[PDB]
Design a protein around this ligand. Structure first.
Ligand SMILES: *[C@@H]1O[C@H](CO)[C@@H](O[C@@H]2O[C@H](CO)[C@@H](O[C@@H]3O[C@H](CO[C@H]4O[C@H](CO)[C@@H](O)[C@H](O)[C@@H]4O)[C@@H](O)[C@H](O[C@H]4O[C@H](CO)[C@@H](O)[C@H](O)[C@@H]4O)[C@@H]3O)[C@H](O)[C@H]2NC(C)=O)[C@H](O)[C@H]1NC(C)=O
Ligand SMILES: *[C@@H]1O[C@H](CO)[C@@H](O[C@@H]2O[C@H](CO)[C@@H](O)[C@H](O)[C@H]2NC(C)=O)[C@H](O)[C@H]1NC(C)=O
Ligand SMILES: *[C@@H]1O[C@H](CO)[C@@H](O)[C@H](O)[C@H]1NC(C)=O
Ligand SMILES: *[C@@H]1O[C@H](CO)[C@@H](O)[C@H](O)[C@H]1NC(C)=O
Ligand SMILES: *[C@@H]1O[C@H](CO)[C@@H](O)[C@H](O)[C@H]1NC(C)=O
Ligand SMILES: *[C@@H]1O[C@H](CO)[C@@H](O)[C@H](O)[C@H]1NC(C)=O
Lengths: 436, 45
């Protein structure tokens, strides 16, 4: 061969997988995710295809879901830091049934003029927020009394999800898998480089994925391993299913004095009949959606297998479907969607809630005045396998489930991978440097 | 005697489940109240 000599090159387009922090970006305008500090979005972002190069994607290793997990919780706690403690409101409640029982009409006597202007301030309380005192009437008190000090969320904080974007830092790039058939992992062929991702709204829910993206012209079902009962099945829907939710009760609210310079909002009277929360779901769209899902499930789980039975498994907040329409947390019985194996949902409202899990300090929602209405659609859902059974293709009871809230972002992040680019490299050449 | 066996009565149900909860205390952690029995309290008071 030729006498070869070392030549140094810079700008070499090669890279290695790496994990780092992506910068937030937002369509700039006390909403939790509406941080005062965030990069304005690019009105004309670029995307280029590699084509000579493929890349190994694995949605179960995208560490970006961890960044979102921690940052989102931090933002929640920060916005709701200067909020009102319920500590002096642990006073026992003399409760009777509210005439029309999920709502009790109770009284108490605290603080009784501890350098302030206060009184008994009777009010309405929800069953799901209190603990019975079986040694009394039965009487009630705040369920938090024997656990922790919790605060009433600041009335000035909105909880509307914001579609936050995330962009690569210098020296790093975001690769995207554009294969319509891409599942949990593999050598994605259609790979492109993206300057910055689209916005993902931090929607928090249990059992069904709401207001997300749609599948590429068919239902696509993903899992780490369809044979492993310890894994979950992620279903991305071809078209979404329409759901319309309402809180028909027109509620008032009252500010009460709890100390000098301190106020607390209580549920006031209710105007009109007291009715149940519920959501209306189109059976047509729901059933047709299931048809496509079943067809795909057959590919792995058998051609005559009975699927989709009633809700079961986990504590009440896992067994019920959960969402936060209007700022109030609704827990509805999804069984009405899965009450027939191979639509109006009854629903209750809770105010003392836990953002995915909370230790010690927790959030109590304020009462919302008026009526709550919203509209959304089911764009995905999580199925769980019921466990061991006869191998024969008889049953596989894909119950709704999933309590790991991180999957509400992983379900979108699966498209992306972050790498570190190494511009420095060498190769042989023909001649020696003309060294004197 | 370096260890005293003492009682008290606090918080007496300030929205809680409490009682007199007698316990052992060390001499070196308390201050005598020479106007009482002598009785004691936390030296940090
Ligand atoms: C999935 O995505 C959908 C669509 O984004 C969400 O549904 C919407 O949620 C927003 C949340 O704010 C609703 O917006 C509210 O509408 C109220 C009345 O709506 C009428 O009036 C507004 C006036 O601008 C019109 O834009 C609208 O079209 C209607 O004509 C407003 O009164 C609300 O503002 C008040 O409340 C907020 C509370 O934070 C205050 O800050 C304001 O200052 C003001 O007091 C608010 O704008 C919207 O109506 C919903 N759509 C529908 C059809 O109902 C789903 O919630 C989302 N699902 C999930 C799972 O996230
Ligand atoms: C859909 O998922 C299957 C199962 O994981 C993928 O097939 C495997 O891909 C891995 C990638 O490293 C290979 O090691 C296995 O040998 C593959 N298994 C078989 C039997 O082919 C498949 O590639 C995925 N489809 C897409 C489009 O990503
Ligand atoms: C609640 O009020 C009734 C009013 O007659 C009273 O008899 C009862 O003892 C009260 N309960 C409590 C918790 O004090
Ligand atoms: C996905 O939705 C489109 C909507 O027009 C439909 O035409 C298509 O048939 C659906 N895919 C399957 C697998 O049915
Ligand atoms: C789902 O709801 C959103 C709400 O804005 C709507 O824009 C979208 O078109 C809906 N999806 C379908 C498939 O109708
Ligand atoms: C609730 O009832 C009061 C009664 O006066 C009415 O003024 C108010 O508009 C009602 N609110 C809603 C949202 O219907």
């Amino acid at each position: 061969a030729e006498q070869l000599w070392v030549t140094v090159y810079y700008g070499v387009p090669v890279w290695k997988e790496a994990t780092t922090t992506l910068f937030c970006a937002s369509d700039a305008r006390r909403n939790v995710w509406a941080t005062h500090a965030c990069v304005p979005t690019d009105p004309n972002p670029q995307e280029v295809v590699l084509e000579n190069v493929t890349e190994n994607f694995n949605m179960w290793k995208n560490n970006m879901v961890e960044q979102m997990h921690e940052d989102i919780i931090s933002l929640w706690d920060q916005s709701l830091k200067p909020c009102v403690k319920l500590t002096p409101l642990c006073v026992t409640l003399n409760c009777t049934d509210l005439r029309n029982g999920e709502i009790k009409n109770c009284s108490f006597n605290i603080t009784t003029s501890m350098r302030d202007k206060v009184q008994k301030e009777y009010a309405l309380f929800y069953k799901l927020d209190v603990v019975p005192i079986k040694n009394d009437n039965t009487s009630y008190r705040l369920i938090s009394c024997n656990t922790s000090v919790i605060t009433q969320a600041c009335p000035k904080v909105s909880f509307e999800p914001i579609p936050i974007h995330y962009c690569a830092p210098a020296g790093f790039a975001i690769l995207k898998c554009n294969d319509k058939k891409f599942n949990g992992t593999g050598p994605c062929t259609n790979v492109s480089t993206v300057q910055c991702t689209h916005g993902i709204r931090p929607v928090v829910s249990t059992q069904l994925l709401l207001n997300g993206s749609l599948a590429e012209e068919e239902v696509v079902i993903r899992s780490a391993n369809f044979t492993d009962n310890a894994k979950i099945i992620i279903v991305q829907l071809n078209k979404s299913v329409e759901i319309n939710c309402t809180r028909p009760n027109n509620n008032t609210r009252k500010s009460i004095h709890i100390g000098p310079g301190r106020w607390f909002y209580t549920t006031g009277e209710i105007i009109g009949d007291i009715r149940q929360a519920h959501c209306n779901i189109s059976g047509t769209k729901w059933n047709d959606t299931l048809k496509q899902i079943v067809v795909k499930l057959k590919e792995q789980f058998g051609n005559k297998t009975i699927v989709f039975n009633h809700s079961s498994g986990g504590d009440p907040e896992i067994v019920m479907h959960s969402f936060n329409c209007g700022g109030e947390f609704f827990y509805c019985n999804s069984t009405q969607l899965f009450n027939s194996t191979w639509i109006v949902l009854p629903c209750r409202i809770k105010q003392i809630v836990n953002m995915w899990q909370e230790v010690g300090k927790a959030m109590y929602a304020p009462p919302i005045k008026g009526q709550i209405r919203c509209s959304s659609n089911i764009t995905g859902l999580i199925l769980i396998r019921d466990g061991g059974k006869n191998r024969s293709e008889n049953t596989e009871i894909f119950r709704p489930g999933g309590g790991d809230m991180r999957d509400n972002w992983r379900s979108e992040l699966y498209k992306y991978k972050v790498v570190k680019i190494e511009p420095l490299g060498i190769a042989p050449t023909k001649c020696k440097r003309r060294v004197v």
